[PDB]
Amino acid sequence: EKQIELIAFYVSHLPQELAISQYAVFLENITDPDQRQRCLELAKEAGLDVASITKTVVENTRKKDAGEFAHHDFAPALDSGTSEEDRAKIDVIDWLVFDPAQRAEALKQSNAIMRKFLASKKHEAAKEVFAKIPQDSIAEIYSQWEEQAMDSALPAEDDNAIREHLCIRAYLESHEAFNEWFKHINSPPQKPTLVGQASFTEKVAHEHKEKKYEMDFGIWKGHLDALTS
Amino acid sequence: ALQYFYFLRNEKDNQGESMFLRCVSELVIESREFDMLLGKLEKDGSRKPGAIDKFTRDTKTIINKVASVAENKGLFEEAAKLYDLAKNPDKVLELTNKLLSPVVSQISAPQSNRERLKNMALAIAERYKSQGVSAEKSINSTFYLLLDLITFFDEYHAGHIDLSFDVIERLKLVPLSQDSVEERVAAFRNFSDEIRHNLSEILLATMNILFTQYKRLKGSGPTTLGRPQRVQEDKDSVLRSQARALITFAGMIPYRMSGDTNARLVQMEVLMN
Amino acid sequence: MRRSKAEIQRYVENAQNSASSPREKSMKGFLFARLYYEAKEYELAKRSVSSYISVQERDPKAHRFLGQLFEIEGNVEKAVGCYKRSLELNPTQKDLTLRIAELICTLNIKDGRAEYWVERASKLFPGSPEIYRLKEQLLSSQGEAGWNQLFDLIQAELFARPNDVYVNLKLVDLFLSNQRLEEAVLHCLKPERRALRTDIEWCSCVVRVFKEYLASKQGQKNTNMRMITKELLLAQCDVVFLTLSKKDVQKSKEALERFDQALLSVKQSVSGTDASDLSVTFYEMRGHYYMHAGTLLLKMAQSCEVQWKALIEPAALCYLLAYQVPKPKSKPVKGDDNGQGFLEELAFDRQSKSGHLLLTLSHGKQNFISEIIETFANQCGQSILLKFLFEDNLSMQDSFMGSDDISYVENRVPDLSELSQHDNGSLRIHNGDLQHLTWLGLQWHFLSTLPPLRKWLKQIFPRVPQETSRLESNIPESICLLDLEVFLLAVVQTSYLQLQDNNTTADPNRPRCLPLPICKQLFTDRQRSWWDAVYSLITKKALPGTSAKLRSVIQHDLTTLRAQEKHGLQPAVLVNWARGLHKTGYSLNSFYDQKEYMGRCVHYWKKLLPLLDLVKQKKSIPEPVDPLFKHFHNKDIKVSEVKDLEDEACIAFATLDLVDGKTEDAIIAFESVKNVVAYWNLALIYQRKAEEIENDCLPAEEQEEFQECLLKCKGFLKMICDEYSAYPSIATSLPVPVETVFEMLDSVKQSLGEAMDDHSPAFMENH
Amino acid sequence: EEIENDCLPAEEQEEFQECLLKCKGFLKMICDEYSAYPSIATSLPVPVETVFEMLDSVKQSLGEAMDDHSPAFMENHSVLTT
């Protein structure tokens, strides 16, 4: 019968296990930001843990997908495109990021799907997701951890996420430096290449090109030396 | 159906197209039958005066619009048969290329029915081109290119390496040497979107074949286990030439793709270097 | 912290729980330092955070807290070190490197680490005011060798982004430090600063720089000095306007003192303030001061104070003197055009505003001259005239600069053509300001005059949108002037209704329409956003990437406005559309324009009729989900003008039928209905047909048809006069006054040849 | 405490010190009223131990040797932290 304003007020009467297991499938098919925020407000008013519901949704989707080549670089057989589960993995992030409260688990799942993409060869999607997500993720994580006033039960998940994010950022910076260097090699190497000089305007254009090449070479060497250091 | 269409056609246009056209399009896409209503087909014949054709004209344009609507919706074999009945080699080859382009990216081994569908579509297109006037010059060039590419793809997927190597050498379209990079770049400017997009998979298959050949050459002994040192040196020199031509092409073409593809390109370049 | 019974109980409980091992306290040192910092205790907080760092060096939160504590205390070097340690641990903040660079530059460091962090910040974050500030503070610590690099950097930054108030201020400061007053003056007089010369702080800084330059180089008479003086006077007038727009006697006195100081500084350098262009500049300053004094008087009279009925005469005399004195329209020496353009724009704006306000206060024509003459006569009249010319200056009156000089007030009235030209000139720099168009429409409706919407739209969009009546194939690029005119008329009518509903406690002696600076956005921002998007898509001032979605949204909005495929408006706004279309159509004498207007009318009515069928049973008003206007006055539930609405719908139907070739059904519906608009349109059509027939030959059948049409037109005018004399609702629902109708009836009777009083008399309308 | 929870420059630190001085003056007035006649502990629902703990917390939050505002009272029946 649909009507999302009547499901949360009746799910709470069910046992917690079955209620969560069914709210998972209920929220798996939810679109539109207005309807999403309406369901969020309804769940918050009824007293349902929609955050853990979405976390269990993501966990069930990952368990059904059974990962992608585990966490090891496994090259596909012959010629093939992307995996069929990558679309769902990249689409489930919308409802996960729609609730900014569980930043720790959000970054944990982001690192998990990043390892899955690195194993299944998806550096482009990895770069797009990294550009979409901010860089102060671990910063906000430890800020929330120190603001929640609960340092007695401090595990190692924060440090693991810090190390994972640092390694991912380093690998992405290395890859971007490599492709920028290759594109600069494909382009003229900022050297005075003889292309035919026999007039005043020709020599003026050649001098201007040499000056621009020197400036571009200086900027390239500077930023590449910084990144490589 | 025709009795109702005779009354539906009396209404003029209303907010784009016509209600009669929309109704007949919905009916034909829900029925999927035209061997007696629009025209029978032996294998690639023309159109026949069907029931609706014996009362209304503009049948060619009607069939073309119906096939275009079916292609925009998501129909392939029936739209191809309809265009073959309406006699339109340009549109036939266009839809053939549009349906074979996304399958080139994935595998081509006999595992489902898409490969059989593309094979029968290619056979129908080639027999239509043989019996009658084909498409334009660029369209026929792209058709031959895609035929050779899928041939090399299936030859590589079947497990053979020497066959793929000799067909890719006889194609006479990959960068051979430095003096050939110029004409390769000159011909690249007259390609198409699909011809520029499938280059990724083409280079991937080429680098896979080249790496397999290099691994076999390294496993084979220089002085023992066959393959004399002179043959090894000749193979190394031809690999040097092929890599230099390919890297010059990829460096002086006005088109860039992705970091992974670029890294693999340079990897094969230095492997053969 | 907080120490109470249960508080100290929980404290000692936690202390006993963490006393099992020193590692428990070592790991709870974070909360320990938190409670410390809550209860000050900087030394204890630092000790606890140092213990926490020694326990888990891989925790950037402790390092950040220690850096914050050091910055709060005063150890800037220790805070910089802690922030650098946190950054080396992990990039916890993008602005962290910028803050580190700024702090190290304040501490004056330039050996290795400082330059490295500055370069890292410049490579990470792009060109920004903070980046430029830290780079300048780093380069200023090296001396002249660093000063040259700072000059090169600021030159590159100015070449990159020339429109930057902070960059301009820093360049002015650098010029003042290097004692380059001429360079600072040139940078301030650059033509790229005319668009930025608007903020109060920037204008005051420019005024101070000009005053310092004049005090330093007093004793020279040059064209550059004259231009500097003119620009300083313009900036002084601008800051005086900005300070007197409010109601602050202290700000008024401060502005007066600033103007006096500027005049004293000018008299020390430039010999007087009257020359080739100096006289025109002084006249413009006096006119602007008079206009602003009149505007302030009107505002203080509208704001319901202690004097609002007798202050309308001094303001009128001040406006008359401001109109009599010359205004900046054509400078004799064309050289300072960069500021002359903005000066002419502001002069046109203030002239249009003052004219509209005076005409709205006088209700039609300036009838205050009769009362002025009747009041001014003997010695008491002369004294009152002098006091009105000198305005009022007591304890709360703000009119220090409003004192008129030696002159006399001449009787004059503004011109409608001049007002239209001023509005067209203002729209060019407004770029289609919806608030300005709304204020102009409100003033025109208060003055009871047809607003030049065609000229307004032609001046707003340089592409000149043509007039079309499309019904199929919605195209966003093929914009029609009819939809824009309909939207403008609807907005104007809604704002007029809102003003009439809000002016319940207002006096008739006060200005009905609010001035421009206080009447901004009388509706919903959605309409302004839609108008801005339309203007951008027309003038190609959007983005080619989002041009597709912009065109799609514009086409959807145009379809929703035309109401031919998607509907969801309001009956009130549809009635406003119909009324505006009728007022814009029946006021002129055209052919195809009237046909397109009637087509738009019937296209609106064909969807308004189902909406009107719901408001007759006293049900719910069909309001959309998106509030387009203020939902407090557009409630259609009263059965009052529903008969007139049905009559107008029948008129539109009959006109569409006559256009489609159904004259019999059209005349049948016209004779069945009883509305003055029907007979007016019939008379217009009959006159057009008679003219088109007389343009050719006149056979017997054509002459008989012309006589029958003239008789029908005479009868239609007679019944129009009867309906007008019946109930006063015709005077409101008729876009054409009865005087023109009676004149046309008399002309038709004279052309026919009749003169008796049995049907349409001579010196009266009815019988 | 809510103000001190955030970063405080010179003006905010001086206003925090002024608020602490006002609270200390209120507590000193309460202590003087309690010492003038031994009936505050019986009148108020909380004993004098709560007031003593409040005064101790205020003296601890005032600081130790870095307060920008010098006190103008004497610690009665309590310890001296600042």
Side-chain angles (χ1 to χ4, degrees):
Chain A
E1 293 151 1
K2 295 264 105 173
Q3 292 307 119
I4 65 155
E5 302 97 4
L6 316 178
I7 324 287
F9 286 162
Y10 280 113
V11 150
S12 308
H13 298 85
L14 279 86
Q16 290 309 121
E17 310 166 287
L18 308 181
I20 288 163
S21 301
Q22 267 65 246
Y23 217 93
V25 197
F26 157 72
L27 211 72
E28 201 93 36
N29 310 304
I30 285 299
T31 182
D32 219 11
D34 308 336
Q35 299 318 110
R36 183 78 193 185
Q37 81 102 9
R38 281 305 289 131
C39 184
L40 258 280
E41 278 185 298
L42 283 153
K44 286 280 112 176
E45 283 162 52
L48 290 176
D49 44 357
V50 65
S52 74
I53 280 155
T54 316
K55 293 310 176 297
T56 49
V57 158
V58 178
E59 188 204 52
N60 291 332
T61 52
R62 293 306 102 81
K63 270 141 52 179
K64 250 83 85 176
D65 294 2
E68 292 298 307
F69 296 152
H71 295 159
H72 194 33
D73 301 331
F74 189 74
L78 300 184
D79 290 359
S80 48
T82 184
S83 289
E84 62 266 12
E85 297 92 2
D86 304 342
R87 310 303 307 137
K89 283 200 303 286
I90 210 172
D91 285 337
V92 83
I93 319 294
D94 314 344
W95 310 301
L96 198 69
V97 78
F98 273 171
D99 299 332
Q102 281 76 22
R103 183 74 260 178
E105 198 72 27
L107 194 65
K108 282 306 284 185
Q109 295 154 307
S110 87
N111 290 142
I113 66 164
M114 274 326 108
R115 275 191 309 266
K116 292 309 185 171
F117 284 148
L118 289 183
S120 175
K121 252 60 68 184
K122 217 48 187 171
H123 306 279
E124 311 298 318
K127 285 187 285 292
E128 275 117 20
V129 172
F130 167 70
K132 281 304 194 290
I133 68 170
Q135 292 184 70
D136 308 318
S137 297
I138 52 179
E140 298 164 272
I141 280 180
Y142 69 62
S143 192
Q144 287 184 330
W145 194 261
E146 70 102 28
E147 277 180 71
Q148 83 177 7
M150 201 69 199
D151 279 342
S152 52
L154 166 62
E157 276 189 78
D158 296 339
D159 301 331
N160 294 158
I162 285 164
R163 186 64 166 177
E164 286 157 332
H165 200 235
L166 218 56
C167 295
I168 284 168
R169 282 188 283 198
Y171 178 70
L172 291 178
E173 278 159 73
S174 191
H175 211 78
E176 80 101 18
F178 184 77
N179 62 52
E180 170 149 62
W181 164 88
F182 179 48
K183 100 187 178 74
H184 278 56
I185 284 296
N186 294 137
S187 298
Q190 324 299 306
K191 302 294 298 189
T193 306
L194 172 66
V195 292
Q197 322 297 328
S199 176
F200 168 68
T201 60
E202 287 197 301
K203 87 173 188 63
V204 160
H206 194 64
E207 286 158 58
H208 290 174
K209 190 171 64 72
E210 283 168 290
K211 170 71 63 188
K212 281 306 163 278
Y213 280 174
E214 285 294 322
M215 287 183 176
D216 294 350
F217 205 55
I219 296 162
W220 176 28
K221 298 300 106 176
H223 91 275
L224 207 64
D225 260 319
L227 284 167
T228 315
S229 64
Chain B
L2 299 195
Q3 291 343 282
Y4 300 148
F5 297 159
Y6 184 78
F7 271 99
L8 282 184
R9 68 110 168 172
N10 269 336
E11 182 184 356
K12 314 288 183 294
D13 298 352
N14 274 334
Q15 313 308 122
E17 305 167 69
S18 191
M19 283 280 113
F20 153 81
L21 298 163
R22 275 163 272 221
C23 179
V24 301
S25 307
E26 287 150 5
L27 252 62
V28 298
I29 68 174
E30 280 152 4
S31 62
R32 288 164 309 277
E33 181 255 329
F34 53 89
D35 38 30
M36 204 63 208
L37 309 189
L38 289 180
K40 70 180 292 295
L41 294 99
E42 294 92 1
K43 53 134 170 178
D44 44 23
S46 313
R47 82 177 321 279
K48 304 303 183 63
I52 183 58
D53 318 332
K54 282 165 158 81
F55 287 94
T56 62
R57 289 173 179 84
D58 207 55
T59 61
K60 289 267 188 169
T61 314
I62 284 307
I63 289 183
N64 288 348
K65 185 180 173 58
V66 160
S68 314
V69 159
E71 274 135 13
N72 289 355
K73 232 58 76 175
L75 305 192
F76 285 154
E77 314 303 311
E78 41 267 20
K81 251 82 85 178
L82 220 44
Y83 268 157
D84 275 300
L85 170 86
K87 286 286 179 191
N88 280 314
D90 297 328
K91 310 301 171 307
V92 157
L93 289 202
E94 275 153 47
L95 71 92
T96 313
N97 304 336
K98 277 182 292 215
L99 83 97
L100 73 91
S101 180
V103 195
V104 154
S105 315
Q106 65 217 63
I107 210 178
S108 309
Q111 306 308 308
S112 190
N113 49 358
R114 191 71 254 174
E115 57 271 15
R116 259 97 82 182
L117 253 54
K118 81 158 72 175
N119 281 333
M120 68 99 69
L122 263 284
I124 289 168
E126 77 101 18
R127 74 194 51 194
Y128 181 41
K129 287 161 68 63
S130 296
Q131 273 103 28
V133 161
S134 69
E136 216 185 0
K137 36 179 68 66
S138 179
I139 315 295
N140 297 323
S141 71
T142 314
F143 196 68
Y144 294 147
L145 281 164
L146 289 172
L147 260 156
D148 290 324
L149 288 193
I150 65 168
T151 311
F152 155 72
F153 263 137
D154 64 61
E155 280 164 307
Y156 152 74
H157 287 324
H160 295 85
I161 304 107
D162 315 314
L163 311 181
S164 61
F165 202 31
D166 62 57
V167 299
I168 216 165
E169 282 324 291
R170 207 251 158 274
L171 182 60
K172 210 185 76 69
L173 279 149
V174 295
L176 256 296
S177 41
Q178 284 81 259
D179 60 341
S180 294
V181 178
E182 279 84 62
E183 49 97 11
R184 283 326 158 195
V185 157
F188 175 76
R189 270 275 92 195
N190 304 343
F191 276 164
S192 295
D193 285 5
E194 285 155 295
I195 321 178
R196 291 177 172 87
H197 284 347
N198 60 1
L199 278 175
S200 176
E201 292 89 6
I202 288 323
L203 289 163
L204 253 64
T206 306
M207 81 179 65
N208 275 125
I209 277 303
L210 283 191
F211 183 48
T212 301
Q213 205 43 67
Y214 201 77
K215 186 62 186 69
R216 290 171 62 199
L217 204 74
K218 285 292 151 297
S220 312
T223 56
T224 64
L225 278 87
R227 305 200 203 212
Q229 187 76 50
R230 36 207 68 87
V231 178
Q232 304 298 86
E233 287 317 296
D234 295 332
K235 187 59 162 55
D236 289 340
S237 189
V238 83
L239 280 181
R240 292 261 185 91
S241 188
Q242 286 181 217
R244 276 193 290 275
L246 281 155
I247 198 68
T248 314
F249 192 64
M252 83 193 224
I253 50 165
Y255 169 59
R256 319 295 290 135
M257 191 181 174
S258 304
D260 304 323
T261 308
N262 285 7
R264 281 186 307 259
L265 277 153
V266 195
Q267 274 152 22
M268 81 173 185
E269 139 69 28
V270 195
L271 266 180
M272 305 330 139
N273 202 0
Chain C
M1 72 188 288
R2 210 64 155 272
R3 271 191 161 205
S4 298
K5 282 296 188 65
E7 298 297 289
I8 207 64
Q9 276 159 22
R10 262 88 177 184
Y11 284 164
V12 301
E13 273 158 28
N14 297 358
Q16 288 159 184
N17 291 323
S18 55
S20 171
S21 294
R23 299 303 105 199
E24 276 188 300
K25 306 168 178 176
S26 303
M27 81 107 64
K28 253 87 80 178
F30 206 102
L31 320 171
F32 287 161
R34 282 199 317 125
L35 282 172
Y36 287 155
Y37 174 58
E38 285 176 36
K40 222 176 191 186
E41 283 160 340
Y42 288 155
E43 288 88 2
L44 296 170
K46 284 195 293 302
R47 174 179 292 111
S48 285
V49 78
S50 67
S51 301
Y52 193 88
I53 283 162
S54 288
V55 164
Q56 286 288 109
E57 301 277 333
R58 284 206 100 268
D59 275 28
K61 36 178 177 193
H63 295 98
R64 284 291 302 257
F65 199 65
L66 186 46
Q68 282 297 132
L69 276 164
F70 272 134
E71 199 62 83
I72 287 162
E73 284 167 272
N75 301 344
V76 199
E77 294 156 304
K78 302 309 190 272
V80 164
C82 290
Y83 292 154
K84 279 159 51 169
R85 165 72 177 180
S86 322
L87 194 58
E88 196 186 333
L89 278 174
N90 46 358
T92 173
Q93 182 181 83
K94 284 97 170 182
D95 287 354
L96 187 76
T97 319
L98 281 85
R99 284 161 43 175
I100 288 160
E102 275 189 10
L103 289 160
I104 215 166
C105 290
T106 317
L107 292 165
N108 303 140
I109 307 292
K110 54 186 183 179
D111 274 351
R113 275 302 181 145
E115 313 191 284
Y116 165 72
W117 289 126
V118 159
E119 187 181 3
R120 284 282 174 198
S122 190
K123 287 190 187 289
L124 176 67
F125 206 74
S128 274
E130 294 184 295
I131 284 290
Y132 163 64
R133 260 297 309 279
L134 61 93
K135 283 191 147 178
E136 163 198 66
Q137 289 291 282
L138 173 71
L139 291 172
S140 56
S141 295
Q142 293 157 256
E144 292 313 286
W147 206 95
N148 290 121
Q149 195 57 75
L150 169 58
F151 181 54
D152 300 347
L153 189 58
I154 191 44
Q155 280 310 101
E157 284 267 60
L158 195 70
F159 291 154
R161 302 183 316 278
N163 273 349
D164 206 356
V165 185
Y166 206 92
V167 156
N168 292 316
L169 182 58
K170 292 316 281 185
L171 197 45
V172 164
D173 292 347
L174 281 180
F175 282 143
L176 287 163
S177 300
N178 207 21
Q179 299 306 124
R180 293 198 280 184
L181 315 175
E182 183 159 53
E183 297 264 43
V185 159
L186 286 160
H187 181 223
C188 288
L189 292 173
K190 280 302 179 184
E192 297 183 77
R193 314 278 164 270
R194 296 298 173 264
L196 306 180
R197 264 207 196 160
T198 323
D199 296 343
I200 162 164
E201 178 69 33
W202 170 258
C203 283
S204 310
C205 182
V206 166
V207 156
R208 285 296 305 124
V209 162
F210 281 169
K211 284 181 46 174
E212 286 296 321
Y213 188 68
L214 286 155
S216 61
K217 308 286 186 310
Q218 55 161 79
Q220 299 169 359
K221 329 289 181 186
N222 310 121
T223 61
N224 202 254
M225 224 78 199
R226 297 291 196 277
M227 189 252 284
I228 287 156
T229 297
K230 194 251 183 181
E231 292 287 336
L232 163 82
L233 285 176
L234 177 62
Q236 187 66 34
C237 194
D238 290 324
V239 302
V240 156
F241 192 95
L242 285 172
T243 45
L244 268 157
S245 301
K246 280 93 174 177
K247 317 294 181 296
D248 293 320
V249 190
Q250 306 316 112
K251 275 187 190 182
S252 306
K253 282 285 223 301
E254 188 188 297
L256 164 73
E257 186 69 33
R258 194 149 73 254
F259 183 62
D260 290 1
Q261 287 309 105
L263 283 195
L264 177 71
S265 67
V266 161
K267 95 162 197 66
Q268 285 298 106
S269 183
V270 172
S271 176
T273 333
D274 271 345
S276 302
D277 293 359
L278 283 197
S279 186
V280 184
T281 309
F282 184 72
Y283 291 154
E284 161 254 322
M285 292 313 162
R286 257 182 72 192
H288 200 176
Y289 288 156
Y290 296 156
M291 226 82 74
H292 193 68
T295 313
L296 199 59
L297 255 69
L298 289 179
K299 281 173 186 165
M300 78 104 79
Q302 168 66 232
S303 285
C304 312
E305 276 199 298
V306 302
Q307 283 168 294
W308 73 96
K309 307 201 182 171
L311 298 191
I312 57 175
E313 315 207 315
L317 299 185
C318 188
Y319 277 147
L320 285 200
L321 196 40
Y323 298 153
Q324 279 315 294
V325 298
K327 298 311 289 311
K329 290 187 186 291
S330 52
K331 286 302 289 284
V333 180
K334 296 221 73 159
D336 320 339
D337 39 11
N338 309 343
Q340 183 187 357
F342 178 66
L343 181 52
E344 169 188 297
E345 287 307 304
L346 194 51
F348 283 168
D349 297 5
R350 72 164 163 267
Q351 273 172 76
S352 165
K353 175 183 49 66
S354 53
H356 270 149
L357 279 166
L358 194 51
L359 285 178
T360 314
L361 193 70
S362 61
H363 307 303
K365 289 308 199 174
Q366 278 190 250
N367 296 113
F368 290 160
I369 47 173
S370 79
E371 296 173 282
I372 278 302
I373 293 299
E374 284 170 354
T375 43
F376 303 156
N378 316 114
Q379 307 287 94
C380 181
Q382 289 312 105
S383 315
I384 294 169
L385 155 76
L386 288 162
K387 97 153 178 269
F388 277 169
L389 188 83
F390 294 142
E391 293 213 295
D392 197 10
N393 274 314
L394 282 173
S395 66
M396 75 287 287
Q397 309 296 108
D398 277 341
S399 170
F400 304 99
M401 311 177 167
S403 170
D404 303 356
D405 292 15
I406 165 71
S407 185
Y408 264 77
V409 164
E410 289 197 325
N411 297 321
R412 224 254 290 169
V413 282
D415 293 349
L416 301 181
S417 308
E418 280 186 57
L419 287 164
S420 299
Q421 194 263 330
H422 295 153
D423 296 356
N424 291 338
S426 298
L427 282 164
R428 277 309 302 160
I429 63 159
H430 284 329
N431 298 317
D433 190 41
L434 199 45
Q435 312 97 241
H436 191 86
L437 287 150
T438 294
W439 163 66
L440 288 182
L442 288 202
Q443 293 273 35
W444 280 121
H445 255 276
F446 269 123
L447 297 192
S448 301
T449 317
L450 300 145
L453 306 160
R454 299 104 169 99
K455 300 204 285 182
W456 287 352
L457 293 165
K458 280 158 184 168
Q459 281 298 311
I460 285 158
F461 315 103
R463 313 302 166 207
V464 190
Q466 80 276 356
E467 289 187 53
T468 50
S469 198
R470 303 165 297 123
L471 78 159
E472 292 196 328
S473 312
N474 305 318
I475 300 290
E477 283 172 84
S478 298
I479 188 64
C480 313
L481 214 82
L482 310 187
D483 312 310
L484 313 176
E485 285 169 343
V486 153
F487 193 84
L488 286 171
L489 284 153
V491 172
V492 163
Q493 284 188 38
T494 48
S495 297
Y496 192 82
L497 288 169
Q498 287 173 63
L499 197 48
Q500 284 323 107
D501 293 1
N502 277 322
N503 283 332
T504 320
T505 49
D507 281 31
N509 303 111
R510 307 171 177 149
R512 309 303 284 172
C513 186
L514 308 157
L516 182 59
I518 80 166
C519 179
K520 290 298 196 176
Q521 197 162 111
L522 272 176
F523 33 81
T524 308
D525 201 45
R526 219 276 315 168
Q527 325 299 96
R528 177 58 168 137
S529 307
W530 174 79
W531 195 250
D532 195 33
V534 162
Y535 172 76
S536 296
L537 196 68
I538 285 316
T539 49
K540 274 305 183 174
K541 302 307 209 292
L543 194 71
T546 62
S547 283
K549 43 155 285 282
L550 275 154
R551 275 172 160 112
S552 180
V553 167
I554 287 315
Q555 183 191 303
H556 283 110
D557 295 341
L558 198 48
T559 308
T560 314
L561 197 132
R562 284 173 295 160
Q564 85 270 30
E565 284 198 66
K566 318 293 190 301
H567 199 64
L569 261 304
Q570 267 178 349
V573 310
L574 276 154
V575 165
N576 290 344
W577 291 357
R579 284 311 299 156
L581 275 162
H582 290 326
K583 285 158 73 74
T584 44
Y586 294 103
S587 298
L588 318 170
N589 292 345
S590 180
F591 198 60
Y592 301 89
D593 293 352
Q594 197 71 239
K595 253 74 170 178
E596 293 161 284
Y597 285 146
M598 293 302 110
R600 194 61 58 194
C601 281
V602 70
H603 287 149
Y604 286 161
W605 274 114
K606 74 186 184 56
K607 283 201 177 181
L608 177 51
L609 287 195
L611 293 195
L612 285 187
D613 284 357
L614 287 168
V615 306
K616 266 195 285 290
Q617 208 261 328
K618 305 268 305 184
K619 257 185 294 199
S620 295
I621 297 107
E623 311 200 292
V625 292
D626 41 350
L628 311 182
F629 292 107
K630 302 289 178 48
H631 298 323
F632 89 108
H633 72 118
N634 299 125
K635 319 291 183 178
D636 286 5
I637 207 173
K638 178 168 50 66
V639 189
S640 57
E641 307 300 317
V642 195
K643 39 181 183 294
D644 277 348
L645 295 179
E646 171 69 27
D647 283 345
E648 287 153 44
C650 289
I651 289 158
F653 287 147
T655 323
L656 191 59
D657 292 331
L658 202 135
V659 165
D660 296 352
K662 266 66 142 160
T663 322
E664 307 97 4
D665 303 330
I667 196 62
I668 280 169
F670 279 146
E671 280 171 338
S672 73
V673 305
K674 190 71 173 295
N675 204 237
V676 279
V677 185
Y679 313 132
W680 178 247
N681 181 55
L682 276 156
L684 287 184
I685 285 288
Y686 284 150
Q687 282 143 20
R688 274 172 291 210
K689 288 188 162 181
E691 281 179 66
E692 289 158 40
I693 285 296
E694 286 181 60
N695 282 355
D696 292 316
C697 182
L698 301 176
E701 303 292 326
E702 259 87 1
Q703 188 59 230
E704 287 153 50
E705 287 290 327
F706 160 68
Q707 290 291 308
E708 286 289 327
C709 284
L710 262 203
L711 274 172
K712 283 182 295 173
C713 169
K714 199 175 164 175
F716 289 154
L717 294 152
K718 192 56 182 55
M719 59 189 63
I720 272 182
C721 294
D722 295 346
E723 198 81 13
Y724 178 73
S725 189
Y727 40 88
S729 294
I730 297 300
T732 310
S733 297
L734 240 187
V736 170
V738 75
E739 320 180 270
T740 318
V741 166
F742 190 50
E743 170 157 70
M744 189 174 291
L745 170 65
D746 281 349
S747 299
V748 163
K749 184 183 73 143
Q750 286 315 115
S751 192
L752 262 164
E754 302 176 56
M756 67 297 277
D757 288 355
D758 296 333
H759 194 274
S760 311
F763 64 102
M764 69 266 282
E765 324 177 312
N766 322 298
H767 288 302
Chain D
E1 284 185 62
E2 281 163 17
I3 286 158
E4 191 50 67
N5 278 315
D6 210 2
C7 178
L8 304 188
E11 303 273 359
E12 288 208 288
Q13 268 189 86
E14 96 186 73
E15 93 185 1
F16 174 65
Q17 282 296 285
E18 280 273 356
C19 292
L20 275 187
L21 272 184
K22 289 162 176 174
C23 185
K24 185 186 297 308
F26 267 102
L27 285 172
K28 276 308 154 196
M29 288 294 112
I30 292 159
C31 278
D32 289 350
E33 287 172 72
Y34 156 73
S35 303
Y37 28 86
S39 307
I40 288 307
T42 59
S43 294
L44 281 171
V46 283
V48 84
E49 300 171 301
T50 315
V51 189
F52 286 159
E53 286 158 333
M54 201 49 236
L55 187 64
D56 195 15
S57 57
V58 162
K59 199 61 164 163
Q60 278 158 9
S61 180
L62 196 78
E64 30 198 284
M66 63 193 175
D67 51 326
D68 290 353
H69 283 261
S70 308
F73 301 96
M74 220 287 287
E75 288 296 318
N76 305 340
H77 308 82
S78 181
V79 294
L80 279 91
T81 305
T82 317

